[PDB]
Amino acid sequence: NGQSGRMEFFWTILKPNDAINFESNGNFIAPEYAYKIVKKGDSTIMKSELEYGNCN
């Protein structure tokens, strides 16, 4: 996509009541938004080329 540089992303699950401490000096791509895991349950990542069928 026209770029010879690279971006490498990382992640963690930060438990309630815990903190994440960054320190940097260059090349940091900082978080702005993060995701609360509001509900857990059965799901899956289906691989399909199809689209929403307005059905149940």
Binding site: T44, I45, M46, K47
Partner: protein, 177 residues
């Protein structure tokens, strides 16, 4: 068939007995007619119904594939995952197919048995008060009206009550007329 009754000594079945799987055809002075045997047909429905339920139930737990992704240097575990999951679809397909084939034979042979046993039920009620004709039918040595017929159909035939008339007829037949 294993029991030699359906498409055996009884050659072909009755389009005209509609209210059961096994039953009777009778013929006497007052006419003729078909009548299902309720009790045998019911045992059969019970059997087959239970069978279909047992199959559904035993196939209830059974392997359920789940998708997992792997990167370009996890090819050995991606292959081990594919093969594991294909391995179970194969075990389970064999199990379903083979259960179906094996139980179909038993079912078809079950009905065959059921007709043989019903034939034998009538045979051992009547004994020498009737003559086995060989095609699935009995010819009585005595007059058997609709009340007498029902007694055959429902387990109640009184052999002693007709045996005298029976011995007189057998006597006439051996003597030549």
């Amino acid at each position: 068939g294993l029991f030699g009754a359906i498409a055996g000594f009884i050659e072909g079945g009755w389009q005209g007995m509609v209210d059961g799987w096994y039953g009777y055809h009778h013929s006497n002075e007052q006419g003729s007619g078909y009548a299902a045997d309720k009790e045998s047909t019911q045992k059969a429905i019970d059997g087959v119904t239970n069978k279909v339920n047992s199959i559904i139930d035993k196939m209830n737990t059974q392997f359920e594939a789940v998708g997992r992704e792997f990167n370009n240097l996890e090819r050995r575990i991606e292959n081990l995952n594919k093969k594991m999951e294909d391995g179970f679809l194969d075990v389970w397909t064999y199990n379903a197919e083979l259960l179906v084939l094996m139980e179909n034979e038993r079912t078809l042979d079950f009905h065959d048995s059921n007709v043989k046993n019903l034939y034998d039920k009538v045979r051992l009620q009547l004994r020498d008060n009737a003559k086995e004709l060989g095609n699935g039918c009995f010819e009585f040595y005595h007059k058997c009206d609709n009340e007498c017929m029902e007694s055959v159909r429902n387990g109640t035939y009184d052999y002693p009550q007709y045996s005298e008339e029976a011995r007189l007829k057998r006597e006439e037949i051996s003597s030549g007329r």
